[PDB]
Amino acid sequence: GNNVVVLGTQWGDEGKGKIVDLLTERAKYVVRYQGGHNAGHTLVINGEKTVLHLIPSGILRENVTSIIGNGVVLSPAALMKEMKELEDRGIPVRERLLLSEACPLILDYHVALDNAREKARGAKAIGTTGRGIGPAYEDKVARRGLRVGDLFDKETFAEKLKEVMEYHNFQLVNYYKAEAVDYQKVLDDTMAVADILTSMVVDVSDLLDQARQRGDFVMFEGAQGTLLDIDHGTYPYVTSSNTTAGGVATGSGLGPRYVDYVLGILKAYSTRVGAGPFPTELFDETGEFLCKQGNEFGATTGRRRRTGWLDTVAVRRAVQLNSLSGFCLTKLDVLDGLKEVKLCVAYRMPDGREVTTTPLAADDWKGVEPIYETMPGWSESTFGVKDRSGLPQAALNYIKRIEELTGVPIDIISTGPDRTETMILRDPFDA
Numbered sequence: 001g002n003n004v005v006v007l008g009t010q011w012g013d014e015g016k017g018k019i020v021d022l023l024t025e026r027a028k029y030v031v032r033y034q035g036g037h038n039a040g041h042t043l044v045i046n047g048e049k050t051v052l053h054l055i056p057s058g059i060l061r062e063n064v065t066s067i068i069g070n071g072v073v074l075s076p077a078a079l080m081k082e083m084k085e086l087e088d089r090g091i092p093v094r095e096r097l098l099l100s101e102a103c104p105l106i107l108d109y110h111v112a113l114d115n116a117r118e119k120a121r122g123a124k125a126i127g128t129t130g131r132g133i134g135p136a137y138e139d140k141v142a143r144r145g146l147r148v149g150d151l152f153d154k155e156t157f158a159e160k161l162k163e164v165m166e167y168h169n170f171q172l173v174n175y176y177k178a179e180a181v182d183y184q185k186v187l188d189d190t191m192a193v194a195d196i197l198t199s200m201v202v203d204v205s206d207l208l209d210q211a212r213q214r215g216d217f218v219m220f221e222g223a224q225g226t227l228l229d230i231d232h233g234t235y236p237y238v239t240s241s242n243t244t245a246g247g248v249a250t251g252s253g254l255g256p257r258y259v260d261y262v263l264g265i266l267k268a269y270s271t272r273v274g275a276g277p278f279p280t281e282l283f284d285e286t287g288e289f290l291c292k293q294g295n296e297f298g299a300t301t302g303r304r305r306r307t308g309w310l311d312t313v314a315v316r317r318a319v320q321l322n323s324l325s326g327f328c329l330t331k332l333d334v335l336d337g338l339k340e341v342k343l344c345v346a347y348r349m350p351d352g353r354e355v356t357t358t359p360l361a362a363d364d365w366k367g368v369e370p371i372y373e374t375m376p377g378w379s380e381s382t383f384g385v386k387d388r389s390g391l392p393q394a395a396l397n398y399i400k401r402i403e404e405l406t407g408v409p410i411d412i413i414s415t416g417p418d419r420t421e422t423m424i425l426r427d428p429f430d431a
């Protein structure tokens with residue numbers, strides 16, 4: 001297909017950055033359509049690492065125009081910190097990254113709000129990345145937030161910023177009894193980059209339309225993951241945006257009928273960062289093994305990721321929610337050496353019933369127990385394997401069983417972090 005969507009099928013960190021970097025070799029455009037700098041991805045080429053947050057995972061290819069669509073909540077500081085890091089590395093960010101004037105702005109006070117509230121929640125805290133993503137989407141939806149296009153008129157922006165900061169500070173001081181955020185500083189800081197921000201503005205919805213008509217390849221990149229979706233996730237232990245496939249059209253401006261192939265990034269085991277339901281979570285040695293072997297640490301906060309087996313019941317919600325066309329199985333190599341691997345095939349409900357559908361809100365996951373299928377592991381090293389022939393029979397069975405359980409094929413297999421430690425059985429663009 002011309003327009004390919006690549007998102008997380010679990011709880012984020014499935015390996016989207018690497019895959020987007022890899023597949024963008026044929027694309028003209030790459031588009032982030034939701035989230036903000038809460039996302040954190042580690043790309044690796046010839047051993048060289050690059051960690052992205054707000055910048056799309058195709059920023060390393062000059063033949064590709066990276067774009068942050070209207071759905072993304074944009075942090076000027078974050079953007080500036082990333083542009084500079086890459087520029088000092090030979091990536092002329094400014095000339096390949098375009099952005100939507102509609103993107104909501106994440107300013108200092110949103111971080112204060114994020115923190116104040118998270119502390120207010122006490123024990124029931126969400127475990128957010130402290131990037132102020134929540135408060136940004138809140139201001140947006142309330143129709144009081146600031147967007148990129150507001151910088152078009154510096155004078156009126158400053159006024160809008162004064163009264164809004166006024167609004168939020170009353171809450172920070174009086175209600176939360178927290179430090180107020182200084183207006184003059186946020187204004188200065190922002191104005192310091194106003195011209196850089198505006199220079200990258202393009203009418204992305206119309207752009208994508210023109211691109212579509214010409215038949216150009218577009219790769220849409222999702223942040224976080226399906227079970228973190230604001231509507232369809234383990235509410236309230238979710239993020240504030242639609243991490244699923246529908247977020248593509250809302251936060252880009254492209255029409256829904258123009259999604260040709262949706263690829264879901266599936267990690268061979270499961271992880272979750274932040275509080276919330278995690279049926280197949282492991283707390284034993286295998287949990288430590290996984291975290292250790294798959295170096296599971298938040299690329300944004302550095303927090304240790306909760307690990308567990310792969311949940312095919314949960315993956316099957318992702319399948320239907322995103323109308324997946326295919327999967328990209330990642331970190332197969334991390335399972336190398338386990339005596340046995342397990343797949344969650346159903347849920348034992350607290351009342352006794354066995355089901356193969358996931359509950360919706362976090363509370364309804366309360367007594368849910370995982371029912372697994374146990375399969376034999378493999379001692380051979382798959383790391384670096386770029387062809388199935390190098391994959392052991394157990395590994396091939398695991399892969400095959402997942403396809404059987406989900407009904408969706410594994411078109412791409414990833415056996416290592418580096419860009420080329422991958423197996424492409426079916427390329428989404430010509431598939």
Ligand SMILES: Nc1nc2c(ncn2[C@@H]2O[C@H](COP(=O)(O)OP(=O)(O)O)[C@H]3OP(=O)(O)O[C@H]32)c(=O)[nH]1
Nearest residue numbers: 013014015016017040041042299331414415416417
């Ligand atoms: N062994 C192995 N490692 C892989 C693979 N894919 C990604 N990583 C490793 O997993 C991490 C991917 O970044 P993320 O935050 O986890 O994912 P996302 O883009 O969805 O947020 C990175 O950390 P990293 O070690 O430097 O190399 C990468 C893979 O197939 N095998």
Ligand SMILES: O=c1[nH]cnc2c1ncn2[C@@H]1O[C@H](COP(=O)(O)O)[C@@H](O)[C@H]1O
Nearest residue numbers: 012038039127128129224238239273274
């Ligand atoms: O990009 C991400 N990767 C993985 N987990 C994330 C990511 N962004 C948010 N989360 C989790 O989503 C929840 C809400 O975070 P927020 O998006 O910072 O408001 C917390 O559990 C986060 O840890």
Ligand SMILES: O=CN(O)CC(=O)O
Nearest residue numbers: 040298299300301302
């Ligand atoms: O890469 C993103 N992380 O896993 C989120 C975090 O560090 O909190």
Ligand SMILES: [Mg+2]
Nearest residue numbers: 013040041299
């Ligand atoms: Mg990540």
